[PDB]
Ligand binder design. Structure first.
Ligand code: SF4
Ligand code: SF4
Ligand code: FES
Ligand SMILES: [Mg+2]
Ligand SMILES: [Zn+2]
Lengths: 208, 48, 96, 125, 115, 690, 86
């Protein structure tokens, strides 16, 4: 591979694969899948019931001790029966490593709050609740953190429109800021950019 | 520009103008395109 | 090549002018209507046709890399002249 | 630990959508047709859900295109027809489903161009 | 089958109990909200608005949806009591600046193409 | 069975004998790059972009032309195939002009996309490029031949699909050029399709030039109404304006093509439009008014008169929803005189049995036929895609075609039996040898056009054709469900109107003139004020100002087919629905909404309030109108045949002459096409050519 | 009181429409010979019970199911509708 191509690292790949197998062996009750990406990133797909145990293990085990929670977020995939996927990114300073833990939920199934494992989760789950409508059970105080007071809906959902449903202005008759249905002087221009002639043969799906 | 002058072009303004906001010479936006749908013109002669 | 509409407004190079009954003309009262006086079609119509003794000629608009993409123009048709699709310059073979 | 309640899923009261953008809308679930300007078929793999077209008018200033419906640009992607139907039903949207169009397989024969007695024989190539 | 994990309530009865508790809290809070925000509405019409908002969701027959709505209503009450909302947020429930939309067929036909 | 096993990238797949490497790769989901190969055209094999490596084979093969062999392992992504693709793309791009910013095929170019996906990212061509002079082939297809890559798709389409052999190649080697070699317009009803098949900007749409980029356009999947074929289309719009019409693939109806009128008549949608309600003033002139005023004025006359004094006429572009709404409104007045401008004979069964007025064989069924007899029709201009299907069957199945009528050019050779209608009887009697030709046929087809039914002998001509079909069934026997008898329609609204119970023709109006007349898009000029009593109240509802509007007392602006979700039934009996691409201009409204509002103002309020309720009403009246792709139905030829033997109308000695004799008669047929400048330019070009 | 039109909606392959189908195949023509100006629109249902609609003056319509009727049953129904007696 020539200078324009990102170099590979087989040593880290082997180490991450071995540790993924190790984690899957220790907790077979919850670990559904283990993957390592070609750029050496380890993800562990677990059942929703194992959020508190697995995280606790990854925080407290002598061989793991992932003591830092870098980020916690959600991804909305409407085609799946379980709509939302919950992603935890953890960092271990002792072993200079990163791990990703993935689980899933739908609109109505609550997910156990992990504030007892990581304090940093407190706001993150709140943001998820604000943006995706995922409820976290036993959260110390769950409420909106980013949207306006009284905002209806969850904007980061795929079916939520980009400009929303209401807009704000100042009305002199009532002498205050009011909210009315959105009306754009220029509509957002939707661009169809995806080309035919697929780009990456290595990701081709079976034709079923 | 005294030692080397800018290139002369026929379309370049011979008289520079300053900011004309808040002045009858101010710019007023408008649509530069023509009518898209032409209405049918009824005939001027009575039918019966 | 600015003209004047029968109402009194200047007709732009795109040919736009509010009709007589158009209320939108009220936006120009006590103010002015921005019209560019240099009409590109007339200005390019004034350039003389280049005489070249070649069947195919290349045009880049002049200035090298400061012009447009270089394109090749065929001059086989004697009835008309070859025109650059970017710049509008005209080229012709020396008939007779 | 489980309720086992029997009722079709309905989340309309939780999504925050205004009332007249649930019952008056008509979504279309379809596999998009191939753009006839090109031969590539990579844009005809997934299912799309899109909303019905609403009014568009001219801005009195600048003559821009103005709209009043918030769902004019909303398009969703789905793996199968069933997934899109389930999403539409749980979101309370009336839908029209269009069955996928697949170009039927064809019989090509280069030698048929040079036919001894059939009309498939070409006059130029 | 169709077994699902609960949120707060196992059947509809517990859900209605939670709904009644939230309704009591809102009904109690309305006069204090009217006085604190210096609203020009009356207590009667504020309680009518609370009743209307509750009745908007009267068709729900799923306990999970019911107690999720109860959670959202409790969040709204928390915002109101702690004066995190302003007067504009409270008055947004009334839509005083919106011209009324006629419902009959002829009026909709006259104003435009929108059903 | 006979399936053979091959391997694509080591994956086993079973294919029929004769399957090429390209189709074998298709079956697994891999699309081989191509420039000259098209599914609907003959194999060319000149662009060499489909070169792929076979395992244990030193030479790459052309996937589009090479039949696959048993046990072959096709390596679609091997290094050899990728290098071949890069070399071919380099050669294709060496002389290509740097016209992408000014080329209309910018974001829709197969050359661009395949260069990005399979070619290199730079050039090592240090020479000068070649330039060729452009060709003029008419006002529809803009030609810039420097962009041509010599794939010969246009030549193959013109020769095989359009039946026109005017395109070709001249010269040799690098200076070989695609054209006509003489100044000549390539003018056919299918001429615009060469824009779609051309992979580059060499052939582009002239009226569409420079107007939009592909990434801007919103695509609305809809149906054409310019004829009765019902070809599926995509309306490309931008910022609330219709920008172009493209064909939409449907194997059973239009395959991959649309007619020139379908493609280029959308220009008329922006001209001579009805945007406001209009009434008559004291001077007798048409003046603008509000919806309430015009609707109340119509409702007053609707209440004043009743029964036979009220009548309606439907035009050729009317949807089923408006038809059923008008029928219900007039029925509430006790008026049954609901008519169409098109004439179908009402004797015998008439519209009682659906198969009596349908193309029972279907468009796809033409591919199963072996003999076809055309009676009093010009399929080339009345139903161009049906004629294209006939041509395809003639080319690939050796279909035998015979015509009774004037010897029009059909783009394929056929047998001209004659011009006199009496020949039909001579075929029915059995003296004509074509009776024997039909007898020996396994899948015979008889197609009678509605244009022939427009004459006074429509009943007798239909009876004679029914006699021919009955003789065929009685002699050749029942091969199964073949449905020999067929009728080819020309207007989009006719079949839905006959399904809803409308009276075909306007003879009911002539027999009993009304005092209030509804013109629902009626622009044929069948009924004028001379055929009507004095002070007849005429209402015109439509979208275009044409022959029907200036004679009206009240004008109600309606929606065109691009501005509503509406139901149309094609000549096959297949129901399809359009979608809203843009909203109606000005104060124009949906047609059935106009009728429902009028019914409410007049006090005879119709039950339905939404489009779903109107379609439920349609299901109540004719349940096949809500099955949106079904073309199957029951055959009642026997009952209609015996019912056609009651009357004995005689045939006149008038030769069967279709309204469309030449191409100039094809461009201007409806109100939308009459308002189009593109069609006017086409008419000017065909009448006098430069 | 005057009958305007009749519509018969029958299904093509369903057993419940079978008798109705037979009716047509046997005697529709005869009915049309007796009522040359009455429109009897024959149309196709799908996954739906067979039906007979009758339209009278001023848009009044009545529909009667023909599910699993024999040919004689639909003949009797049509005769009852045509003669005006209930
Ligand atoms: S045909 Fe394609 S590659 Fe050639 S100039 Fe046009 S857009 Fe560019
Ligand atoms: S004009 Fe277009 S379709 Fe015809 S040979 Fe050239 S590239 Fe191919
Ligand atoms: S696609 Fe096979 S050679 Fe062109
Ligand atoms: Mg092209
Ligand atoms: Zn130039």
């Amino acid at each position: 591979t020539r200078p324009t191509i990102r170099p590979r690292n087989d040593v880290v790949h082997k180490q991450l694969s071995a540790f993924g197998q190790y984690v899957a062996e220790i907790l077979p009750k919850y670990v559904q899948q283990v993957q390592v990406s070609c750029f050496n990133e380890l993800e562990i797909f677990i059942h929703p019931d194992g959020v508190i145990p697995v995280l606790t293990f990854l925080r407290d085990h002598t061989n793991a001790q992932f003591k830092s929670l870098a980020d916690l977020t959600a991804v909305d995939v409407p085609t799946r029966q379980n709509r939302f996927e919950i992603v935890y990114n953890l960092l271990s300073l002792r072993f200079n490593s990163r791990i990703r833990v993935k689980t899933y939920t739908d609109e109505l199934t609550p997910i156990e709050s992990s504030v007892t494992v990581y304090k940093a989760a407190n706001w993150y789950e709140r943001e998820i609740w604000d943006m995706f409508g995922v409820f976290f059970a036993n959260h110390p105080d769950l409420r909106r953190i980013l949207t306006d007071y009284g905002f209806e809906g969850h904007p980061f959902r795929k079916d939520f429109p980009l400009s929303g449903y209401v807009e704000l202005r100042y009305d002199d008759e009532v002498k205050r800021v009011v909210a009315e249905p959105v009306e754009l002087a220029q509509e957002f221009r939707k661009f169809d950019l995806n080309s035919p002639w697929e780009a990456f043969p290595a990701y081709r799906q079976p034709p079923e | 520009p005294t030692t080397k002058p800018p290139t002369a072009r026929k379309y370049i303004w011979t008289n520079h103008k300053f900011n004309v906001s808040g002045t009858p010479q101010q710019y007023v936006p408008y649509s530069t395109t023509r009518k898209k749908i032409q209405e049918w013109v009824p005939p001027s002669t009575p039918y019966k | 090549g600015v003209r004047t509409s029968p109402t009194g407004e200047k007709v732009t190079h795109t040919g736009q002018a509010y009709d007589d009954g158009d209320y939108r003309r009220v936006r120009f009262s006590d103010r002015q209507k921005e019209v560019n006086e240099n009409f590109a079609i007339d200005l390019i119509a004034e350039q003389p046709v280049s005489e070249v003794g070649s069947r195919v000629i290349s045009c880049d608009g002049g200035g090298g890399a400061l012009g447009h993409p270089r394109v090749y123009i065929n001059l086989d048709k004697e009835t008309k002249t070859g025109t650059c699709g970017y710049c509008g310059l005209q080229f012709r073979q020396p008939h007779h | 630990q489980l309720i086992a309640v029997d009722e079709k899923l309905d989340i309309t009261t939780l999504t925050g959508v205004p009332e007249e953008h649930i019952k008056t809308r008509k979504v279309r679930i379809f596999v998009p047709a191939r753009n006839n300007m090109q031969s590539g078929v990579n844009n005809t793999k997934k299912w799309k859900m899109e909303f019905d077209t609403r009014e568009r008018w001219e801005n009195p200033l600048m003559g821009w295109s103005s709209t009043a419906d918030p769902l004019s640009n909303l398009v969703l992607t789905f793996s199968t027809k069933e997934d899109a139907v389930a999403f539409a039903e749980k979101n309370g949207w009336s839908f029209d489903v269009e069955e996928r169009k697949v170009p039927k397989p064809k019989s090509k024969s280069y030698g048929a161009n040079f036919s001894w007695n059939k009309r498939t024989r070409v006059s130029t190539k | 089958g169709t077994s699902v994990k609960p949120i707060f309530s196992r059947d509809m009865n517990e859900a209605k109990r939670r709904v009644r508790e939230l309704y009591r809290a809102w009904y109690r809070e309305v006069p204090n909200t009217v006085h604190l925000f210096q609203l020009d509405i009356s207590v009667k019409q504020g309680r009518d608005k609370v009743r209307e908002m509750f009745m908007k969701n009267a068709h729900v027959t799923d306990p999970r949806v019911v107690d999720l709505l109860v959670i959202k209503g409790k969040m709204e009450l928390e915002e109101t009591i702690n004066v995190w909302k302003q007067r504009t947020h409270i008055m947004r429930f009334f839509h005083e600046t919106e011209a009324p939309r006629p419902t009959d067929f002829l009026s909709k036909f006259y104003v435009g193409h929108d059903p | 069975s006979n399936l053979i096993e091959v391997f694509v990238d080591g994956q086993s797949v079973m294919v029929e004998p004769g399957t090429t490497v390209l189709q074998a790769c298709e079956k697994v989901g891999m699309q081989i790059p191509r420039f000259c190969y098209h599914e609907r055209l003959s194999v060319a094999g000149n662009c060499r972009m489909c070169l792929v490596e076979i395992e244990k084979a030193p030479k790459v093969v052309a996937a589009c032309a090479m039949p696959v062999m048993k046990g072959w392992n096709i390596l679609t992504n091997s290094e050899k195939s990728k290098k071949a693709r890069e070399g071919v793309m380099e050669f294709l791009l060496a002389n290509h002009p740097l016209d992408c910013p000014i080329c209309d095929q910018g974001g829709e170019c197969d050359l661009q996309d395949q260069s990005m996906m399979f070619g290199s990212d730079r050039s090592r061509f240090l020479e000068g490029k070649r330039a060729v002079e452009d060709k003029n082939i008419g006002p529809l297809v803009k030609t810039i031949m420097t962009r041509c890559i010599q794939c010969t798709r246009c030549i193959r389409f013109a020769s095989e699909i359009a039946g026109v052999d005017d395109l070709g190649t001249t010269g040799r080697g690098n200076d070989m050029q695609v054209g006509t070699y003489i100044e000549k317009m390539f003018m056919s009803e299918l001429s615009g399709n060469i824009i779609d098949i051309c992979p580059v900007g060499a052939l582009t749409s002239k009226p569409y030039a420079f107007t939009a980029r592909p990434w801007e356009t919103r695509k609305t999947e809809s149906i054409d109404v310019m004829d009765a074929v019902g070809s599926n289309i995509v309306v490309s719009t931008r910022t609330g304006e219709v920008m172009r019409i493209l064909p939409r693939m449907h194997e059973d109806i239009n395959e991959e093509w649309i007619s020139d009128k379908t493609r280029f008549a959308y220009d008329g949608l922006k001209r001579q439009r009805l945007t406001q309600p209009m009434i008559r003033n004291e001077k007798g002139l048409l003046t603008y008014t509000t919806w309430e005023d015009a609707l109340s004025r119509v409702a007053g006359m609707l209440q004043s008169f009743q029964g036979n004094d009220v009548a309606a006429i439907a035009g050729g572009l009317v949807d089923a929803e408006a038809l059923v709404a008008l029928k219900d409104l007039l029925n509430r007045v006790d008026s049954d005189s609901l008519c169409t401008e098109e004439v179908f004979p009402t004797a015998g069964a008439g519209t009682d049995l659906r198969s009596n007025y349908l193309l029972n064989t279907t468009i796809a069924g033409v591919e199963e036929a072996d003999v076809i007899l055309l009676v009093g029709t010009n399929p080339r201009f009345e139903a161009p895609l049906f004629n294209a299907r006939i041509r395809k069957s003639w080319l690939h199945n050796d279909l035998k075609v015979a015509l009774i009528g004037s010897p029009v050019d059909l783009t394929y050779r056929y047998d001209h039996l004659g011009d006199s209608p009496k020949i039909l009887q001579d075929i029915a009697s059995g003296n004509h040898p074509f009776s024997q030709i039909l007898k020996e046929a396994k899948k015979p087809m008889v197609v009678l056009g509605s244009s022939a039914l427009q004459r006074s002998d429509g009943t007798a001509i239909l009876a004679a054709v029914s006699n021919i079909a009955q003789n065929i069934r009685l002699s050749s026997g029942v091969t199964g469900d073949w449905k020999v008898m067929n009728i080819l329609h020309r207007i989009a609204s006719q079949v839905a109107a006959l399904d809803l119970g409308y009276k075909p023709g306007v003879e009911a109006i002539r027999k009993n003139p009304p005092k209030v007349l509804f013109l629902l898009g009626a622009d044929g000029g069948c009924i004028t004020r001379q055929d009507l009593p004095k002070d007849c109240f005429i209402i015109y509802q439509g979208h275009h100002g044409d022959v029907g509007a200036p004679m009206a007392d009240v004008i109600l602006p309606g929606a065109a087919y691009t501005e509503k979700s509406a139901t149309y039934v094609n000549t096959e009996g297949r129901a399809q629905q359009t979608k809203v691409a843009v909203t109606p201009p000005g104060l124009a409204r949906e047609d059935w909404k106009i009728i429902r509002a009028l019914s409410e103002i007049a006090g005879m309020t119709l039950p339905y309030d939404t489009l779903d309720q109107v379609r439920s009403r349609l299901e109540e009246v004719s349940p096949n109108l809500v099955r949106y792709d079904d073309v199957e139905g029951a055959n009642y030829f026997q009952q209609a045949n015996e019912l056609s033997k009651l009357v004995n109308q005689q045939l006149l000695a008038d030769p069967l002459v279709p309204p469309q004799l030449t191409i100039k008669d094809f461009y201007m047929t409806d109100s939308i096409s009459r308002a189009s400048q593109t069609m006017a330019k086409c008419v000017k070009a065909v009448t006098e050519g430069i | 009181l005057g009958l305007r039109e009749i519509r018969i909606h029958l299904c093509q392959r369903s057993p419940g429409s079978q008798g109705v189908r037979d009716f047509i195949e046997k005697r529709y023509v005869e009915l049309k010979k007796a009522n040359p100006d009455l429109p009897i629109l024959i149309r196709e249902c799908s996954d739906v019970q067979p039906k007979l609609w009758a339209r009278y003056a001023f848009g009044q319509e009545k529909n009667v199911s023909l599910n699993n009727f024999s040919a004689d049953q639909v003949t009797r129904t049509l005769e009852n509708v045509l003669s005006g007696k209930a």
